[PDB]
Amino acid sequence: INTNITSLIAQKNLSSSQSALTTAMERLSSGMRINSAKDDAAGQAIANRMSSQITGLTQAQRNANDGISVAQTTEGALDQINDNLQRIRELTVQAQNGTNSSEDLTSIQNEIAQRLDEIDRISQETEFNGVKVLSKDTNLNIQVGANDGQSIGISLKQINAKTLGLDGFNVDGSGATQNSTATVTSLEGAGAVKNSTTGNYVLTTTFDEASLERMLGEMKDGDVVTVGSGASTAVEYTFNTASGSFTYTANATNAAAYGDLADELIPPTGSSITGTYEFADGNVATFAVDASGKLTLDGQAAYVTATGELTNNATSGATQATLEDLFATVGAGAAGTDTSARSLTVGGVTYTGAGTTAGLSYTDTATSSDVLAASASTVASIEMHNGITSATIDFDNTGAQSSTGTQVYVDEDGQLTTVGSYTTTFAVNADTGEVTVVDNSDTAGDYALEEGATVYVGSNGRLTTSTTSKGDVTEDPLAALDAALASVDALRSDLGAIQNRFDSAINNLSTTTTNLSAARSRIEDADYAVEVANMTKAQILQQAGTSVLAQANQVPQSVLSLLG
Amino acid sequence: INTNITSLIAQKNLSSSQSALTTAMERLSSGMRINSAKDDAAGQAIANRMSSQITGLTQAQRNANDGISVAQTTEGALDQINDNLQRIRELTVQAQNGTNSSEDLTSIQNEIAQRLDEIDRISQETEFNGVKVLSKDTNLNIQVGANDGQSIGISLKQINAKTLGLDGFNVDGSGATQNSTATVTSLEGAGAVKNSTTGNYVLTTTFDEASLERMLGEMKDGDVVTVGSGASTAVEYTFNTASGSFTYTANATNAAAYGDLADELIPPTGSSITGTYEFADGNVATFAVDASGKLTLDGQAAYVTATGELTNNATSGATQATLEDLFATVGAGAAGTDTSARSLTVGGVTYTGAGTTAGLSYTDTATSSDVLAASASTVASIEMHNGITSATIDFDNTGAQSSTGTQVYVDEDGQLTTVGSYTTTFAVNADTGEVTVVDNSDTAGDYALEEGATVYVGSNGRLTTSTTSKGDVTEDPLAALDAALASVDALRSDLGAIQNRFDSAINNLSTTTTNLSAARSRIEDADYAVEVANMTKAQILQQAGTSVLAQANQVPQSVLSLLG
Structure with missing residues (x-):
């Protein structure tokens, strides 16, 4: 007639087979089941997240390998440092022998200094990717995960001849002296005066009282200084040594x-x-x-x-x-x-x-300079608690030590003390020239010299009863070398633990990457069997539909041969 | 398809086997099990400490050998000192014989002095590594341990002819008798009044005036003693030494x-x-x-x-x-x-x-007492012919010397001297106590001690600027020689004891070093059988993994043929 309904069904059924065939061809050529969001939107999203995780995990494996490299380089440098330290220790053991002369000690010290310089050179020169791994106490973060925050920390430490406690290490330095027994010349140089009644030189020592700045430097935590006397002008400038700042209630x-x-x-x-x-x-x-x-x-x-x-x-x-x-x-x-x-x-x-x-009113914070400036035209008071004893000191507006209260003084050794002054009387032996102490006004103080002992001149030029001095590494040298070796061994142990942890992390990353790859394959990857079967079925339906359509285009020819 | 999970597993196993193979190779080539802190951190640290101890113990063995050398050298020197002492003792036993003359005593003393000089030369010249082992009373420290403070002390003593008590040892007169340095106390005892202005001490030595009888006792031949006032009453006594009497003109x-x-x-x-x-x-x-x-x-x-x-x-x-x-x-x-x-x-x-x-008028003889009795009430005079002064010495009617005339004085040794008194000032070193001479009296006096010289208190108690004094033969010389021999034997016994102690220390050091080396070998050394087994297993696994990986890469290709 004019309509060919059967040809229309044939055309629709054909066009379905083109779609199926095209999908099969695309899946076969690409090797992927999900070639678009049309195939599986949720599957595509889950697969993309899995792909991102897999790529991140591979990159994290590479990063963990880089961390392994860093740890290996640092431990390699530390091994050489350990070898140098052990040789220095052997040389030190050799040096303690009494048979060595000064020249022998200097020859040993030559190699000891060379090896210490080598330790410093290894410290300053060992570097991975422009990073001095032995120069800073830092933390290297190695990203061993595909997401933010997943990382492993390598605790790097600064290892030189100074941080090991071997700065100025020596075996050829001068050990002890004889202190150059004092005579009357030392007595008159020190300022002792002679009493004509007995002839025994008396030396009076007067110390200088600590300044307000000096005691402010000597303040401890919680120590309270009052600044002011008139009305309520007194300020409780309590010192917070946790921050080095003096808090106070300003108004x-x-x-x-x-x-x-x-x-x-x-x-x-x-x-x-x-x-x-x-x-x-x-x-x-x-x-x-x-x-x-x-x-x-x-x-x-x-x-x-x-x-x-x-x-x-x-x-x-x-x-x-x-x-x-x-x-x-x-x-x-x-x-x-x-x-x-x-x-x-x-x-x-x-x-x-x-x-x-x-x-x-507000708890404001000032500094030591601020409190010093405030207590320049007014009286101040210091309460030195923390130690049960109070030891309260006062300062006038002038700034001198208050007669009332505890009067703190500074000796010639730079140490605070309550002994403002003390007199020591020595006698000079007219025959041998020996000088021996006789009297000490400071009867129970720390500066009292025991009576009857010979007085010598210290290396610092002060009179003393001691007879020796120092000057080389008198601190046990082998003990210091053992401490340095222990520090190096501790850092090496930390690095070895980090290497083992990185090995475990790499194994875990490999396993997780393989498993996630399998999981993503189960979603995205196509099947040979299923897609080729669909291709073959679609091809058969294509041929059948074309044959049926060619036949169907012929029925109205007969019909209109009857209606024509 | 696209994923090859089997190949991924094959790759992971291959990498693990390759890592095991590399570890086995490195252990085999190095010969050590702990090639890094990764292998055994605590084991590495313990092995490092053991290495330090072993190296210290070997160096301590070397130091103990050095101490043995020092002791052997010192004892070898002491053997020669002992031989010299025994020869001196035999010579002294020879010298005690009563038949020996002064020449024989001097002959013996020649060899005795030569042997004492040899003892001193051995003391001063014996030296080990620049250390005079026989010159000071010291303590040599030998390090016989790997840590601080482990040391053995060799108690060295000073052995010379003085410290053995043989200074000035004689069999004839000879004698050394080391003098004593004068001090302030010596100046006070002598009679030197201190000059409170200049700080010096001034002594004045005075000689008594010559008495008439003492001078008649010193009378010489041909000399004259004139008794009486006036030429018409004086009696001249001419002395005769051969007859020992005074001849005069008797009337x-x-x-x-x-x-x-x-x-x-x-x-x-x-x-x-x-x-x-x-x-x-x-x-x-x-x-x-x-x-x-x-x-x-x-x-x-x-x-x-x-x-x-x-x-x-x-x-x-x-x-x-x-x-x-x-x-x-x-x-x-x-x-x-x-x-x-x-x-x-x-x-x-x-x-x-x-x-x-x-x-x-005739020539008559008289005695000295006659002249003294004659002059006991009238002025007298003595004419000296040969002597210090060939002049007249006058005496009053009371027997005292005339002031207006020559004065003769008898010195501290009973001899004539025109110097009635002399003076010398001494400085005192305020520090050392040494008494030096700064000035004296009239320079004509031969008693004037040397300028700027240390004054010494002689064995007679006098003050002289001369070291040593004339001594006598040694008293109980055999006892002193026995004491010196005993001192040498005691030092030799101490040295032998320290040698035995060093031998024991060396044995202990060797044993401990061997034991610690064994322990470190257990901790650190690689068992070669185990490492070869691991190498072989890793190699077999690597080959198996390579084969399996080839098969795994092979498996997907069936899809191409089965696709058609």
Whole structure:
């Protein structure tokens, strides 16, 4: 007729076979089941995540290999350092023999110094990828995972002749002396005067009292220094040695004083710095100040009430609350004469703001120089607790040591002491010239020389009863070398543990990569059998459909031969 | 298809086998099980500490050998010192014989001094590695351990001819007697008054004035002692050393003196004395005097004439002349009015008249005590002929020297010296105590000790600038030699004990080194059988993995043929 419905079904069934055949061909050529999101959207997403993880795990295997390389290089350098240290130890054992002369000791010291220089050279020159692995106490992070944060830390340490405790190590240095027995010439050089009654030279030693700066340097944790005497001008400049800063409760009183510190803390351009204003209304009314002034609560311009409470909206006839508003209100309290136990602990500093009648108060932090400057025209007092004893010292506005209280002094050895002065009387033997101590006013002090002993001249030029001195490595040299060897061995042990951990990590990464590859294969990879079977079926249907369509184009020919 | 999970597993197993193969290869080539801290961290550290100990112990063996060498050298020197001491002892035993003369004692002392010098030379020259082992009392420290403080002390002593107590050892006089340095106490004891201005000490040595009797005891031949004031009353006594007596001009101015002179010359019973009488005209008559003092002229009675002539012709009533008449005739002349001089020789003494004065002058002898008694009440003087001063020494009537005249003084040694007193100032070194000489008195004095020299207190207690003093033979020399031998034997015994201790220490060091080497071998050395087994297993696994990997890469290709 004019319509060929059968040809239309033939065409539709044919066009289905083209689609099936094309899908089979694409899957066969590409080797992938999921060639598009059409095939499997969820499968494609899971497969892409698996692909990203697999690529990251392979790159993490490479990174772990790099970490292995770093550890191997560092341990190789440390092995040479250990060999040099062991040779130095053998030379030191040789040097302790008494048969060696000074020339022998110097010849041994030549090689010892050469090996120490070699240790330093290995430290400064060993490098992996431009990283001095033996120069810094740092932590190298090796990414052994496909996601952020998965890493292994190699704890690198600085190993030179100085950090090992071998700086200035020697065996040829001078060992002990004889102290050059003192005579009357040493006595008159030291300042001793002779009493004509007995002829025994008396030496009076007077020490210098510690300055306020000296004691401020000698302050310990928690030590309290009061600065001021008049009215309430005394300031409790308690020293927080945890930070090296002297905290103190500062107090302001005037309107401009409330105007300043409110402006000092502020967000520069577009930040939202936040200070904890804590009033006894029932909670800490913390604000959200933005830019210059413009104090706000919950993102809306704030308003102070009669009682000082913070709210984000007040009556129409009221300007917005600024930082100065709340902060001077803290200065002036609340409800007029009410105490208003209040505070403005703004991100740190606790602006308590007094809270009796008016005024400010806040635990500000000054420095040692600040307290020294403050205590320059007023009296100061130091309380040295921490040790049960109090040892309270005082200083006038002039700055001299107070007669009252404990008078601390500094000796000629640079050590603080309470022995301000002491007299020692020596007698000079007219026959041999020997000088022997006789009397000591400091009867129980640490500076007393035992009576009757010969006095010698120390290497530092001071009179003493000791007869020897120092100058070489008198500290046990083999013990120091053993300590250095122990440090090197500890670092080597840490590196070996890290190497084992990296080996385990590489094994785990390999296994996980293989397993995830199998999992992704089960989703994305095509099958030879299934796709070739689909191809063959689609081809057979294609041929059948073409034959059927060719036949169907012939029936209306007969029909219209009957209707024509 | 696209994934080859079987090939991935094959690759992982292949890599593991290759890593095991590499470890086995490295252990085989190195010969050590612990080639890194990866293998055994604690084992590596323990092996390193054991290596340090073993190296220290080998070096300690070397040091102990050095100590053995030092002890052997010192004992070898002491053997020669002992041989010299024994030869000296044998010579001393020889010297004690009473038949030895002074020459033989000097001959023995020559060899004794040579052997003492040899002992000193051995002491000063014996040296090990620049260490004089026989010169100081010290303690040599030999390091016999791998750590600090492990050491053995060789107690070395100073052995010379002085420390053995043989300084100034003699069998003849000789003698050394080391002097003692003078000090301030010596200056005070001597009598030196300290100069409080200059700090020096000034002593004044004074000599007593010469006494008359002491100087008559020092009288020489031909010298004169004049006693009396005035030329007409002085008596001159000329000394004779051969007779030891003083001869003088004795005068007889009275008849009593003539009678006493006759009485002195009176011979005993049966004795006669011959003499001669010279007349004024020169005639000489020979006479003999009998026991009664009565004169016999040629065996006949002698008579004195009116002119004093002696003849045997008898005058009527003339009395026979006695001995006394001759002196009267010679002195007072004949009849008291004859001024003719006469001479009479008798008793070996010649008596002559003054010619114008009645008296006899003759030569008479006297003793020193006679001169002293004569001068005990009248001024005296002594003329020195050969001596320090050939001048007159005057004495008052009281026997004291005249101030206005030459003064002679007797020194501290009983000898004559014109230096009455002398002076010397000493400086005192305030530091050392050494007493040096800065100045003396008049430089003419030979007693002036040397300038700028150390003064010494001699064995006599004197102050002299001379080291040593003349000593005597050694007392109990064999005991001193035995004591020196005992000291040498004691030091040799100490050295032998230290040698035995060093031998034991060396044995212990070798044993401990062997044991620690065995322990370190157990910890560190590689068992070669195990490592070869691991190598073979890894190689077989590598081949199997390569075959399996080839098959795994082969398996997917069936898809191509089965695709069609």
